[PDB]
Amino acid sequence: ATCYCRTGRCATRESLSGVCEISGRLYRLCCR
Numbered sequence: 590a591t592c593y594c595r596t597g598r599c600a601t602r603e604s605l606s607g608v609c610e611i612s613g614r615l616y617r618l619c620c621r
Contacts, residue, residue: 590621591620592621593620594609594618596617599617605617
């Protein structure tokens with residue numbers, strides 16, 4: 590997949606696949 594760690598919600602063609610921890614903050618792992 591192509592995945593991004595997002596501060597906001599996933600794009601509509603993406604799926605929330607997990608979460609990322611980066612420098613003490615949580616992000617959505619958004620994959621398409």
